Amino acid sequence: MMPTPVILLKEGTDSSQGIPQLVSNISACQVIAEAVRTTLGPRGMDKLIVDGRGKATISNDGATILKLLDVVHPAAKTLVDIAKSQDAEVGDGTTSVTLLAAEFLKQVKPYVEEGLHPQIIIRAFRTATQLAVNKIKEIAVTVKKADKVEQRKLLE
Amino acid sequence: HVPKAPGFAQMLKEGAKHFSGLEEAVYRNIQACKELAQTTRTAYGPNGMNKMVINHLEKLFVTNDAATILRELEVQHPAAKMIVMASHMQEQEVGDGTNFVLVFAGALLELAEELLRIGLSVSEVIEGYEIACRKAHEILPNLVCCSAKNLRDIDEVSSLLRTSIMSKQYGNEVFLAKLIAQACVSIFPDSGHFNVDNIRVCKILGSGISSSSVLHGMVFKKETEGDVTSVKDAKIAVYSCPFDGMITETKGTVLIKTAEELMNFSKGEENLMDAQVKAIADTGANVVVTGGKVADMALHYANKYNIMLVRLNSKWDLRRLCKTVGATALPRLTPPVLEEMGHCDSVYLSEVGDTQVVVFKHEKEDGAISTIVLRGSTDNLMDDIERAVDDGVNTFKVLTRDKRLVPGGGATEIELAKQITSYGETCPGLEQYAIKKFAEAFEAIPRALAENSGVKANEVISKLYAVHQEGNKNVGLDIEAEVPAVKDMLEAGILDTYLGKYWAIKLATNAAVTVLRVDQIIMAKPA
Amino acid sequence: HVPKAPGFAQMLKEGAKHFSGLEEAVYRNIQACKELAQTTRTAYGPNGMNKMVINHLEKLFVTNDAATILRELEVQHPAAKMIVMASHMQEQEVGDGTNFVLVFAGALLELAEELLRIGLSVSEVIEGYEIACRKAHEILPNLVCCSAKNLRDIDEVSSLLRTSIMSKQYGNEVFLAKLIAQACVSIFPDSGHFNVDNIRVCKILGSGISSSSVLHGMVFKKETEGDVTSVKDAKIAVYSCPFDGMITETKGTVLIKTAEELMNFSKGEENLMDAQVKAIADTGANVVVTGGKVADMALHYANKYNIMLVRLNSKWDLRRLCKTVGATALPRLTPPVLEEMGHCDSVYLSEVGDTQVVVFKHEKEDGAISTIVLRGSTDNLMDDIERAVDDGVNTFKVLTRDKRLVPGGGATEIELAKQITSYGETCPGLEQYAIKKFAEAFEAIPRALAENSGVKANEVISKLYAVHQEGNKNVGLDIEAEVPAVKDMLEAGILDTYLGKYWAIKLATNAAVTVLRVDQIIMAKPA
Amino acid sequence: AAVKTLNPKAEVARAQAALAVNISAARGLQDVLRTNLGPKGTMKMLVSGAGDIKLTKDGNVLLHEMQIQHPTASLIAKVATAQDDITGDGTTSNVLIIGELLKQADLYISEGLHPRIITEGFEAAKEKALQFLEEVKVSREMDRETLIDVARTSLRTKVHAELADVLTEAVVDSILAIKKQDEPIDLFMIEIMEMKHKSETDTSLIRGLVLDHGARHPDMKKRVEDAYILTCNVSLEYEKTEVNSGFFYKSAEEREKLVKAERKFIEDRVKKIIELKRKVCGDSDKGFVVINQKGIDPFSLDALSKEGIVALRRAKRRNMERLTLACGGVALNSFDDLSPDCLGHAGLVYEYTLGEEKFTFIEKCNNPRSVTLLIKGPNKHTLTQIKDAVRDGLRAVKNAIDDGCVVPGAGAVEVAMAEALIKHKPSVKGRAQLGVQAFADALLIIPKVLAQNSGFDLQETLVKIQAEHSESGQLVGVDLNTGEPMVAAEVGVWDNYCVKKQLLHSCTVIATNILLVDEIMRAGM
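The joint structure predicted for all components is written out below.
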């Protein structure tokens, strides 16, 4: 009723702004994460995904599950693209990166609705991220038994 | 029952619209321009927010750079287009500061409305804006505090370009500043023209930004079709001819009259192809680059003479390589090229981001072309960083064109608003009202920076004026922390785009004047 | 491509049409009237043809009498109505000559068109018509030839009414003349006012016209509902009350308290009814006529006292009967009526044409009312003959009012055209053009008689003038034989109706003038 | 537009546009009525939806019975309609003046001026025109001969030039023989009745009155001489009691007694009538005619018929006012004090039937102070034409009887008045001079249209008249026969002050209100 001038600026677009736009973006990310929630661990389950032709694929790898969801939400797509990158850089970092990213948003969801300028959210995300990856390097273990049966057993 | 009003005088259109007068034409043009300025206001400043825009092709583009948002949004109102076009000229002129055009031009039109509703028509408001504008260009040369003259090396440029990076890529203002510094110095034009087209960006999906680097040369995403992918001498021949021998230009037909001619025809052709490939092998060439196709016999002989092949289908990519390696592309079949051969230091293929790429690396003759290789977890991030790289490349050119810098952070705008107002106060006429309003158009700019920073703009702007009591002229707006507690911009290191501010005022003023000069609008029938 | 003409100045209508101008309004009104003049032309004259017309109620009327044809033609044209409505005043005034209006007034309108195109407008043509009309009223009184004064008996009346019959009922000019003379003479008002409403017509299907007759009395088409159908003394008592007793007007309710009041109640009704019928039986009542129903007990007593009952539901039949027999209708129950009874000579019922009728025959008191009984094989024949009867009844009245007869057969109309033309030739002005055309409006009338008679009209008219060399004034059209061979009209006996010709000329002229004075037509939307 | 923002279906006119809408409609109406001004005007055929044809040129009917749908035309129709309540004729002139005040103003408003300026001048011009009107009043002592000229001047404009010689006498005599001693004349004392007998030019003036109903009993006299007229509003039909209880009886014999009893109240009322005939020296015909306005049953009619008394029934409310006066009787509402003193007198009462419709004639009264005009038109539309001419003519002469003076003729005042406005044109001492010019020229629309309808050159006719007045002292105007200037007092054309008063006032109020509208809008739907 309100934005009803005689001539519009553009054509017929939809436009949202502010806190309700972030809340919806976080919620959509929580929904798309559901596809892989039950695929973690040696005791996880497999999925059967059927396309519009009736052709089915059975798997539990996020490299297959997340590519067949046909997500159209502008923001939820992010939790699929990060699996494409992990598939190239790690090779099996699939289901875990989608779930972790969704949880990062959930933990801050109750706070982003009440002020909390986005700049400080980014600062905190970057600070914690750099700390976490530094600690991993300090605790990972290596071997000094290269070119021996011990290295072949390590690969097994 | 109830009658209807008849036609009046000019009911000869086929459904067209028509507007005239202060309320129906002038104010409506201004109102549309307000919506434009408001649309981009949210993204303004280093603390601005991103937009997610889905265009008419169902593609998703995410950024905060208005120069690339406006070209995707299908603005139709004829008044808003006038400001959008000015913002494109700002991009063409200096490549940065485009936000200025929508913020300042919008403020001029909004403030013009305040005058039109109480007093003088556009016939004097426009003239008053020009009087004040001309004075602004006499103030600007007197606000210069620094110059990009000293320490013209990699260390100083890594500091000069940061103001252009942090304005869009806040958290990467250091990492990206180091990468672009390594590129801007690499093509130093021996104190000549800085060719902004000699720095490219290569986007490869993978890990985050920290893995990005600069490569002194070119990277392609094609294959070799052979087992000689590692070349150390890299004596390079470039051709535009297809690698399959000579063909006719009209038709051509083979006439055979005896069995010997039939039997020996094919074998003769293979012998000729051997000589055609040998012609360049005898010169010591290592790599043959073409844009055309390669025959099966060409691959047979390429393996005979251990020749590396690269196919680059894009004519512009091959021309860039020619200038990189120091070679000429020959349109004719491969002669024993001696004097037009190029040289690299290392040519190799690698698998980077699950993409097989061809690298032409230079270590000695580095400054021909540089490629900045970007990594990231999403295509959306890499596209946005690439735009940030462009700003650093263009900003360097702007700094070469005019080495003077004026304090940033709103300090220049506050000084313009103050000094311009003082001039208007001494004008013994009615023009003082439009001159003062021209000054207020500048005040709107640091207000926008405060609004997006989470701080109360009314108190922030009071402080920005309070600290300029004739003896400072350098304190600006601190947007890094709550309660800005305004600080010196020269100690902060915030100052840039002097030339940009010069032309941005001219383009923004002309857009506002053009809108104000429209009193009557005649529309065609919509379709 | 294709243009359209805009509106002009006052397009404020909602679908109404407008016509104005000599050609768009005046001529169109004239031409519409011509179409009606042609419609009735075919039936004009004793040699005319019949129409079969079905009206908006799906009823079929077969006749040549324009007075009834025009009443069934649903004319909607706003001007043509006026020349049709004029014919009503002609029928009301004299009862004959209605054809004159469409022929004469139609001719005046058509002939005006011949002048309005070449010269003076209606403000002068009308004046010429009105001047010439006034002159026609000076010529006509000097063309009277006979008067219906002598031998006022059955044989002269049969002859005098011949014209009113042979003009529509060609083959019956003798048979019907005898019947109508018996009806008009039988109620001769002793040379006073002739009452046309004292002659009725009774249509009974059967054999041909030769079986028609005149009955001195009234005939009804009801039954007796009794067994006293042969009455010779015929003392007639007429009542308006129903023959079933009398009740109160306020409400009426019977209250009984004990058994003796119940058991003896009904006996009171029988005692009252017996005495009420006896009251008139003792006075010699033979016939009791009522408008209401008859009770079962009323029939019981009617048979006891040998009194015939007749029920006449029509109030006009009861009124006419009382005036015929010389009785007073009593609104109350049957008193011992002494003097209010009428008298007939023979009252009986008979089956005529397979319809049982009640006849009240008067042999002594004959001149009170007459009924003309018409027989025929079809309803169409009997309806058309009735119209001929009405023309005779009306013609008799016209002769009573004005006994002057004017020569017919076209002789008067040619003479009027001759003298009126001669007058016009001596008028020292431009009005002579319409005066001469007024004369030609009369010539059009014998031309219609010629065409429908199968003789060439141009030859008839040339001869009619050749035989009127200032001293004849009596030769007209002989339309009983082939070849015009014009002869004296008065030796044949073709003459009548001075008053009709006088009134018709005045009325028809005014109708034509009324149309000519119309300048503009404003149409409404139909619903 | 604000109204379009609030309601997308709202209409509005622009300030430069609303004036054109208002003027265009006024010009459209002017293009209609200009063709009927004066005796030389045209006759219109108005075709209705029932098929009725009205051949008329009266300014009021043409404005009412027209399919013109416009919000401005509906306003001029309102002020025009009022003409026929207070002055009668002059409706064409009212609209013609308004059209030119709006049309001529456009030639000065469009030339850069504010509409207020022309309207301030129009008000000033009215004051000057009114002062002139006062100076041309002519006192003719209201002689009958002056009224004949008034009647002919008005009648000629509604007749076909033959009927004027008939109506002129019927109008002058009918209006005078109503009231004397300078008492206002009530037109409700003059009847108009319609018959279809003969022709237009046989309209008669009857000294007495005619009723639209006749005897309802066959034994009543068709011709009554030396009659006594009794005008009563009593009820002689059967009536019941208010309480709906009815009769309670046992026997059939009682039923008949109840019939005799319940009717006794009727005989008590009727038997009081039959005494009157016996108290008026009934040794001769001495006819007794009773009107009995309300319903009457045949029981009462028959009871009176047996005594030789003529009784009518079902008369109109206005019949018992005019007839009681005309016959000299007393209107009774009861039979409490009946006596011959209540009876009127009429020399002859008779009936005539035309088309099976009875008309009862009560004539030969001494001074009835009420007359009936009997129209004998041949056709329906002719009855309408004449009836309008009669009632308009009676008003025209009434105004000349009420107004002690008469005003010179059709163009005799309008041309001289326009010159009076121009001669004082500079005295406004300001910008209102153009309003005087527009007003003075608008005044000429009457002689200008008259010149055109009569077929004379527009410009030559007015130049000759204006010159003849300017160089003389006579109020000369348009002659519809020669085109030469002639004095109204010599040709016999007069008008009434009341007509010129309203034309100067009502046309100024309406014209100046229209010119000051600049935002025509439609809302609320």
